[PDB]
Design a protein around this motif. Structure first.
Motif, PDB file in Angstrom:
ATOM      1  N   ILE A 152      -4.184  -1.690 -12.384  1.00 20.81           N
ATOM      2  CA  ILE A 152      -4.795  -0.211 -12.200  1.00 20.81           C
ATOM      3  C   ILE A 152      -4.439   0.801 -13.404  1.00 20.81           C
ATOM      4  CG2 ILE A 152      -4.960   1.617 -10.761  1.00 20.81           C
ATOM      5  CD1 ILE A 152      -3.902  -0.338  -8.560  1.00 20.81           C
ATOM      6  N   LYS A 190      -6.547   4.982   0.557  1.00 17.39           N
ATOM      7  CA  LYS A 190      -5.453   5.930   0.347  1.00 17.39           C
ATOM      8  C   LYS A 190      -4.455   5.721  -0.871  1.00 17.39           C
ATOM      9  CE  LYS A 190      -2.472   5.971   3.700  1.00 17.39           C
ATOM     10  NZ  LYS A 190      -2.420   5.801   5.127  1.00 17.39           N
ATOM     11  N   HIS A 191      -4.059   4.532  -0.742  1.00 20.42           N
ATOM     12  CA  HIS A 191      -3.084   3.862  -1.607  1.00 20.42           C
ATOM     13  C   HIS A 191      -3.557   4.031  -3.335  1.00 20.42           C
ATOM     14  CE1 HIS A 191      -0.586   0.952  -3.732  1.00 20.42           C
ATOM     15  NE2 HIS A 191      -1.716  -0.028  -3.850  1.00 20.42           N
ATOM     16  N   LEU A 192      -4.922   3.707  -3.087  1.00 21.95           N
ATOM     17  CA  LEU A 192      -5.523   3.714  -4.521  1.00 21.95           C
ATOM     18  C   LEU A 192      -5.659   5.266  -4.823  1.00 21.95           C
ATOM     19  CD1 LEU A 192      -8.251   0.867  -4.042  1.00 21.95           C
ATOM     20  CD2 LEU A 192      -5.931   0.706  -4.995  1.00 21.95           C
ATOM     21  N   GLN A 235       0.730  -1.090  -0.204  1.00 18.04           N
ATOM     22  CA  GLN A 235      -0.075   0.103  -0.062  1.00 18.04           C
ATOM     23  C   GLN A 235       0.674   1.285   0.097  1.00 18.04           C
ATOM     24  OE1 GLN A 235       0.123  -2.053   2.383  1.00 18.04           O
ATOM     25  NE2 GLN A 235      -0.173  -1.411   4.560  1.00 18.04           N
ATOM     26  N   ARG A 236       2.155   1.059   0.149  1.00 21.65           N
ATOM     27  CA  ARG A 236       3.018   2.094   0.250  1.00 21.65           C
ATOM     28  C   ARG A 236       3.812   2.425  -1.216  1.00 21.65           C
ATOM     29  NH1 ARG A 236       2.551   5.487   3.799  1.00 21.65           N
ATOM     30  NH2 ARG A 236       2.294   4.517   6.050  1.00 21.65           N
ATOM     31  N   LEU A 237       3.734   1.126  -2.035  1.00 20.44           N
ATOM     32  CA  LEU A 237       4.135   1.724  -3.433  1.00 20.44           C
ATOM     33  C   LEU A 237       3.212   2.149  -4.078  1.00 20.44           C
ATOM     34  CD1 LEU A 237       5.740  -2.017  -3.235  1.00 20.44           C
ATOM     35  CD2 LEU A 237       6.859   0.020  -2.668  1.00 20.44           C
ATOM     36  N   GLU A 238       3.668   3.317  -4.935  1.00 23.88           N
ATOM     37  CA  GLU A 238       2.394   4.115  -5.951  1.00 23.88           C
ATOM     38  C   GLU A 238       2.759   3.928  -7.163  1.00 23.88           C
ATOM     39  OE1 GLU A 238       3.388   7.352  -7.166  1.00 23.88           O
ATOM     40  OE2 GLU A 238       1.600   7.506  -8.466  1.00 23.88           O
ATOM     41  N   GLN A 243       4.720   6.540  -1.438  1.00 26.10           N
ATOM     42  CA  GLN A 243       3.522   7.188  -1.259  1.00 26.10           C
ATOM     43  C   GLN A 243       4.347   8.791  -0.846  1.00 26.10           C
ATOM     44  OE1 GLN A 243       1.270   4.787   1.838  1.00 26.10           O
ATOM     45  NE2 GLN A 243      -0.442   5.380   0.418  1.00 26.10           N
ATOM     46  N   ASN A 278      -2.163  10.584  -9.207  1.00 29.76           N
ATOM     47  CA  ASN A 278      -0.606  10.654  -9.746  1.00 29.76           C
ATOM     48  C   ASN A 278      -0.707  10.109 -11.176  1.00 29.76           C
ATOM     49  OD1 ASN A 278      -0.567  11.425  -7.316  1.00 29.76           O
ATOM     50  ND2 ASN A 278       0.949   9.797  -6.576  1.00 29.76           N
ATOM     51  N   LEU A 279      -1.731   9.197 -11.395  1.00 30.38           N
ATOM     52  CA  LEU A 279      -1.821   8.581 -12.797  1.00 30.38           C
ATOM     53  C   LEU A 279      -2.787   9.242 -13.643  1.00 30.38           C
ATOM     54  CD1 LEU A 279      -0.865   6.022 -13.765  1.00 30.38           C
ATOM     55  CD2 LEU A 279      -3.088   4.723 -13.326  1.00 30.38           C
ATOM     56  N   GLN A 323      -4.174   7.899  -4.193  1.00 33.75           N
ATOM     57  CA  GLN A 323      -2.716   8.493  -4.608  1.00 33.75           C
ATOM     58  C   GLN A 323      -2.403   8.152  -6.192  1.00 33.75           C
ATOM     59  OE1 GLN A 323      -0.380   8.162  -0.200  1.00 33.75           O
ATOM     60  NE2 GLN A 323       0.454   7.496  -2.403  1.00 33.75           N
ATOM     61  N   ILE A 324      -2.305   7.132  -6.042  1.00 30.92           N
ATOM     62  CA  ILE A 324      -1.882   6.586  -7.491  1.00 30.92           C
ATOM     63  C   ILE A 324      -2.857   7.313  -8.615  1.00 30.92           C
ATOM     64  CG2 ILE A 324      -1.724   4.454  -9.067  1.00 30.92           C
ATOM     65  CD1 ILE A 324      -1.671   2.662  -6.554  1.00 30.92           C
ATOM     66  N   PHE A 325      -4.253   7.223  -8.444  1.00 30.10           N
ATOM     67  CA  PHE A 325      -5.159   7.676  -9.111  1.00 30.10           C
ATOM     68  C   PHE A 325      -4.990   9.169  -9.679  1.00 30.10           C
ATOM     69  CE2 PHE A 325      -8.672  10.881  -9.083  1.00 30.10           C
ATOM     70  CZ  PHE A 325      -9.121  10.780 -10.341  1.00 30.10           C
ATOM     71  N   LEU A 343      -7.216   2.500 -15.166  1.00 31.79           N
ATOM     72  CA  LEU A 343      -7.393   3.856 -14.625  1.00 31.79           C
ATOM     73  C   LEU A 343      -7.376   4.788 -16.048  1.00 31.79           C
ATOM     74  CD1 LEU A 343      -8.033   5.190 -12.231  1.00 31.79           C
ATOM     75  CD2 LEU A 343      -5.470   5.748 -11.779  1.00 31.79           C
TER      76      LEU A 343
END
Lengths: 76, 76
Positions: A70, B65-67, A23-26, A46, B73-74, B69-71, A74
């Motif tokens: 994702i 949170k994890h998801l 969950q740390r890895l983004e 993150q 940043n993606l 963030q990525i969203f 996404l």
């Protein structure tokens, strides 16, 4: 030679030895330059830390898969 | 009443009780309709399964949170 050959190159000389909570890895990128000593991925946390990891390790491939999915889902 | 009131509504009547591995979770949506009995999130797994979870649970907020963030940043 072209000015592309004198661009600096980022490598992984070492890879993390402890697994990191997913969950740390983004995000991640791959080392691609043959000048580098080993095949590896760089995870972005993150927090923005950068971590070298060995894509042959289980957790690593699993984290890569998770993020790949994702990304392709996404778009949105 | 408008034809919007006779649209079906998806709810969570129950929430998963075991934590699910975050690398499995690929996306989530929120229950938003007041007709539903409880506040909850629906995770979509890699496999496409849909899972109701309680956003008050630690793992759940962490996965959200994890998801998130990525969203953000993606884009790319």
């Amino acid at each position: 030679q072209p000015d592309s050959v004198s661009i600096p190159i980022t490598c992984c000389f070492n890879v993390i030895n402890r697994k990191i909570p997913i969950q740390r890895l983004e995000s991640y990128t791959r080392i691609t330059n043959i000048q580098c000593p080993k095949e590896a991925v760089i995870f972005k946390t993150q927090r923005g830390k950068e971590v070298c990891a060995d894509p042959k390790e289980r957790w690593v491939r699993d984290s890569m898969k998770h993020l790949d999915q994702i990304f392709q889902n996404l778009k949105p």
